[PDB]
Every structure is written in C-alpha cells, then in structure tokens.
UniProtKB/TrEMBL annotation:
<feature type="binding site">
    <location>
        <position position="30"/>
    </location>
    <ligand>
        <name>Ca(2+) 1</name>
    </ligand>
</feature>
<dbReference type="GO" id="GO:0046872">
    <property type="term" value="F:metal ion binding"/>
</dbReference>
<feature type="disulfide bond">
    <location>
        <begin position="86"/>
        <end position="163"/>
    </location>
</feature>
<feature type="binding site">
    <location>
        <position position="33"/>
    </location>
    <ligand>
        <name>Ca(2+) 2</name>
    </ligand>
</feature>
<feature type="binding site">
    <location>
        <position position="102"/>
    </location>
    <ligand>
        <name>Ca(2+) 3</name>
    </ligand>
</feature>
<feature type="binding site">
    <location>
        <position position="108"/>
    </location>
    <ligand>
        <name>Ca(2+) 1</name>
    </ligand>
</feature>
<feature type="binding site">
    <location>
        <position position="34"/>
    </location>
    <ligand>
        <name>Ca(2+) 2</name>
    </ligand>
</feature>
<feature type="binding site">
    <location>
        <position position="101"/>
    </location>
    <ligand>
        <name>Ca(2+) 1</name>
    </ligand>
</feature>
<feature type="binding site">
    <location>
        <position position="29"/>
    </location>
    <ligand>
        <name>Ca(2+) 1</name>
    </ligand>
</feature>
<feature type="binding site">
    <location>
        <position position="103"/>
    </location>
    <ligand>
        <name>Ca(2+) 3</name>
    </ligand>
</feature>
<protein>
    <submittedName>
        <fullName>Uncharacterized protein</fullName>
    </submittedName>
</protein>
<feature type="binding site">
    <location>
        <position position="101"/>
    </location>
    <ligand>
        <name>Ca(2+) 3</name>
    </ligand>
</feature>
<keyword id="KW-0106">Calcium</keyword>
<feature type="binding site">
    <location>
        <position position="70"/>
    </location>
    <ligand>
        <name>Ca(2+) 2</name>
    </ligand>
</feature>
<feature type="binding site">
    <location>
        <position position="30"/>
    </location>
    <ligand>
        <name>Ca(2+) 3</name>
    </ligand>
</feature>
<feature type="disulfide bond">
    <location>
        <begin position="115"/>
        <end position="139"/>
    </location>
</feature>
<feature type="binding site">
    <location>
        <position position="36"/>
    </location>
    <ligand>
        <name>Ca(2+) 2</name>
    </ligand>
</feature>
Length: 170
C-alpha cells in the first residue's frame, strides 16, 4: 500500500453495530434481557497491525460512543470521531471499535472490530469541502465474523497550522 504523507485529517463515522444479541462466544449477552452495549472507537494511525489492547492503544484511550442498556440487537449509532496525521507517512490506518455488554462492574465482550484505510484507490481529498464519505463498510468482528460494525470514513489534506497532535498513548 502506498505511503500517504503530508498533513491530513481522518473522520471515522460509526454508523451502526449488529451484535446479533450475542457475546463473542455465541451465547446471548444476557439470559433474560438484551445487550447493554458500551461501544468505544479509535482511529489508529500508529499500530494498525498490532493486537487489540495495549499492543496498539489502551482501551482507556478510545472514545466512548454508546453507553446504553437493553438495546435492540442492531444499535443505530451515527457518531463520528476524527484524528490528524501531521507530517508523518502512513500506509494503513486502522479504524478500531470495541463493544462489550455491561454486566454491572464486569465486562462481557461482544467483539473487537478492525477495518483498514489505505490510499491506493482513494487517497486523501484536496480539502474538507470536497472530501467524500466512503460507502458503508461492513466490518466483521474478530471473534464472530457475523457480528458487524458498519463504518464510513473521510480523509483530506488540511493546512499544517491546523494539524492537531495526538498519540496512541502506548
Ligand atoms: O428514513 C428515515 C430513517 O433512516 C435512518 O437510517 C437508515 O439508514 C441508515 C444508514 O445511515 C441505517 O443505519 C438504518 O438502519 C436505516 O434505518 C435514519 O438514520 C433514521 O434516523 C431515520 O429514521
Ligand atoms: Ca452479560
Ligand atoms: Ca441487559
Ligand atoms: Ca448485560
């Protein structure tokens, strides 16, 4: 994949999440009621090939998009986060999502989802005003591929003066 360099911004739109009502084991999230999803997201510009968790970016650094109780199996989300690349070159950017079912103080993993942005077909657009959203991407769960988070992304060059520093923080 081609090296994308310059100063640019990536927007990640989390459209919806289909838990199918199940934990990563295939069991239902809960026995007598629906999943209680906490859904978190991160644009990983630094460690796209590394494992979920501390090897790439600690879960505490993700952005919380949903924190809800007894939701339908298909959770409509439409929240968006963004992150900038400031003079470094990248070949792959990993859109990362983690969904868990809350069980009081304990987490019940639904899945981790990772989708890569690469620049061969669709490199960053000239600027924000002309940048087009990707089609919805059906991003499969790492543990249960039939669980999908639907994602879209945009990316576009921005003036260097407007580029925001960031870190995976481990
Ligand atoms: O038509 C009004 C209705 O449309 C919803 O969204 C529909 O398409 C989105 C993709 O953006 C899917 O995620 C939904 O499953 C589908 O219903 C709007 O988002 C919703 O707010 C409106 O009620
Ligand atoms: Ca549970
Ligand atoms: Ca529940
Ligand atoms: Ca629960």
């Amino acid at each position: 994949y081609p090296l994308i360099t310059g100063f640019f911004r990536i927007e990640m739109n989390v459209v919806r999440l289909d838990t199918q009502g199940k934990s990563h084991t295939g069991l239902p999230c809960d026995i007598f009621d629906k999943c209680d999803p906490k859904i978190i997201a991160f644009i990983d510009t630094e460690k796209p090939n590394n494992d979920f968790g501390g090897d790439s970016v600690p879960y505490s650094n993700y952005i919380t998009l949903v924190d809800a109780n007894n939701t339908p199996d298909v959770v409509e989300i439409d929240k968006t986060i963004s992150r900038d690349v400031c003079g470094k070159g990248v070949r792959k950017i990993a859109m990362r999502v983690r969904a868990i079912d809350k069980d009081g103080l304990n987490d019940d993993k639904i899945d981790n989802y990772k989708c890569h942005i690469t620049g061969e077909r669709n490199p960053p657009a000239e600027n924000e005003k002309v940048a087009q959203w990707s089609p919805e991407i059906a991003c499969a769960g790492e543990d249960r591929a039939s669980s999908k988070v639907y994602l879209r992304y945009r990316w576009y060059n921005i003036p260097e003066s407007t580029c925001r520093p960031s870190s995976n923080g481990q």
